Amino acid sequence: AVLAVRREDVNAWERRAPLAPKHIKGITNLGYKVLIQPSNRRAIHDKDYVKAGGILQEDISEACLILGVKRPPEEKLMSRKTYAFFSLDEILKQEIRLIDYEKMVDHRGVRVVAFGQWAGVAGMINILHGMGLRLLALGHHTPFMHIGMAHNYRNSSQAVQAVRDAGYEISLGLMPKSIGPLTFVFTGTGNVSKGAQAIFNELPCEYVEPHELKEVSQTGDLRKVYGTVLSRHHHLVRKTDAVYDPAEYDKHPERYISRFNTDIAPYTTCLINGIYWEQNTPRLLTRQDAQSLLAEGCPALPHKLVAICDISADGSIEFMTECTTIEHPFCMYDADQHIIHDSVEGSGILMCSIDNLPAQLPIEATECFGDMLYPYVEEMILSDATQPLESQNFSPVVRDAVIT
Template sequence: MLRAFSHTNGRCVFHHAKCWHHRKSVLAIRREDVNAWERRAPLAPKHVKELTQMGYKVLVQPSNRRAIHEKDYVKAGGIIQEDISEASLILGVKKPPEDKLIPKKNYAFFSHTIKAQEANMPLLDEILRQEIRLFDYEKMVDHKGMRVVAFGKWAGVAGMINILHGLGLRFLALGHHTPFMHIGMAHNYRNSSQAVQAVRDAGYEISLGLMPKSVGPLTFVFTGTGNVSKGAQEMFNALPCEFVEPHELKEVSRSGANFYLFFLTSDLRKVYGTVLSRHHHLVRKRDGLYDPVDYDKHPELYTSRFNTDIAPYTTCLINGIYWEQHTPRLLSRQDAQKLLVPVRSPAGVMEGCPELPHKLLAICDISADTGGSIEFMTECTTIDSPFCMYDADQHIIHDSVEGSGILMCSIDNLPAQLPIEATEYFGDMLFPYIEEMLLSEGSEPLESQNYSSVVRDAVIASNGSLTAKYEYIQKLRESREHAQSLKMGNKKRVLLLGSGYVSGPVLEYLTRDTNIDITV
């Protein structure tokens, strides 16, 4: 006898019936092995406890790296063992190694395949070959298209902590000691409460007027209104801050152009923030207006005025928006060059109190979408090496907080820095869908499953094929491969003779142009 369930707002509500078949269903939590910093899990012990009390068997692969200790899972009823082949549903956070996949199972994890990401296509091919059913958390959305399972809040929290730490380092490199020097990276705190206290302590020093006058007013711009942005704002609110409307940002920033005037007219004992929504910077190309319905249908007809209306008055950008190929960018490479123009004070500079080189000092790209809404964010940074400098004039990136350019932070696994809270938060959102995902074996036809829309629409692959909703992935792959073949045919070929002292700078210069194929 199957358990009956009804659908309420896209979510399954199960009516528990005594059923021997499903009481023996097995779930596994796989070990995360994508990198040394990945200490999260998809479910916390409290979720395992509830599942075992419902009659399910929960296997947990052993891992000393996991932030939540194994004994807590055992206490909750989980079974620690290496072999998880008994499970019909295998949960993870990040992608598993291709050689560890088990054929014809249900898998759930962030696959990063929905944009046909080249690095993950071998994994997708192996999933198809082994006839695995893949649920992708990223595509679990409600009837409004909003994600129902995500780490977004904790990406925002960790990202904000990190960029405040980075600003402390950048200011110091520019000749300024600031209270931000006392804020560490997010993973240095046992939990977010400790981090909040550190930010509050820095904020207390700011409230005492201990920020250098020559840096002027600090302005923080948060893009988007989702969980990422809210998480970042939650941490920002621990500072003495005032939120202003986007159109007020210019005046707030201008009052600091002459720091002597600023000292007389503005309050150095706080920082300023603004939250940017679509209507604040997106306009239709033909008439300069914004229509939300029209934008959703035809985003390619719109452009962003962020580069002219917002960015020139921004000290630190916290970017959390989702970007797609046909939507407007926030900043291009050309925009960055225009923004890195020095703003000189007519009053001159006091020795030992240098001016800032330009207004836009830092970008925390929490979206971590390379080449996306921030075009010149071409590669993610890491927890090991969290910051880099983008030199717009030279169009080069170097691992430092010194030199010319914009400080960049674009870590793609931010919640791993606060793994326990992130695991509990994520598990709370995922748990209502677990039992539904356990109802079938991965080898059974997808058409025979009575999934809710939230779960069904998250199935990328099943029974050896891409599902109908995701067949476009193959077309994207073919299109990219065709474009790459054409590009290779149009490449300039350069033969560089010699490997002496002269060759190094020449090679570095030539490699900036991706249309040049170099042979040394």
């Protein structure tokens, strides 16, 4: 009846953990022994887990349940243990049980163990930092220059203070007037969209309805930034009669299109995309839409759309084919329909599509992930990869999450 948190080795930038010291304290209070594999890579220091009752050892063969952020590869995986991770044949010989956090879903079917809003919180900070660089490359110093990447801050609190400081400069009228008012569009309904809005709320922001973007993008107060939250009924219409039936779209999305390209996109400065996109879902923007959207000392912007940030890792933007890295976060989409990875001064739209956004705020990501995983840890400690799964007293959340 021993638990172990293994060290991450998949990536040099994987600084998260499946549990925080607060969760190790609660598990040790139940009487369970917790082993902590040493890791200079983790954002939360080893001694914080030791202060919470965790024992730090390099050998975790004593444990029955071994928790990790990503799946252990080849030799590191050993027999007669129960593992859990994100992401056959010889499983039965080695008698090991593998659990995938992604498969932990409730009766409704929505995932219970995720990273929550922190992909959106980090994405909003990154795209605000990216707009500062992109607008300066176009010849405009803005308060967005005083916002760094999400991983340059100890936590979201420190990042919020930087966003509020830059927002104060905007309220003082220090924005260049020639580029006009800035409009931000939030798509999607998940927690990542709410996390992006949480950062946006620290600016001198004003929320408007999607139909107001056309007027707001022309006459908006230059001491403010403007945002709108896009719902399905704002842009999805039937191909035949332009009617929106919410139940019909949820069953037959192939009967609908998106007027985002004509109704919203021409009046959008920055698009924060958190859309859940399936293969037969109407696309938000096509390649031809991008071609149409791109056509003295205080000059205006070449095009209204400055940048796009993908915070849900999800084909709705046709020309956002490739992904980016925390070290190289931004790329450009040229009017020649080419992807430029480092030419922020080039022609086009700034684009950001980092796949490990929560890893930029790994402390709070570890705590939020650990808060979701905590109510299922004890039943996973009592797991016996030797005994059959039917004998184990698993909740349907954990039982369905077993991939072996």
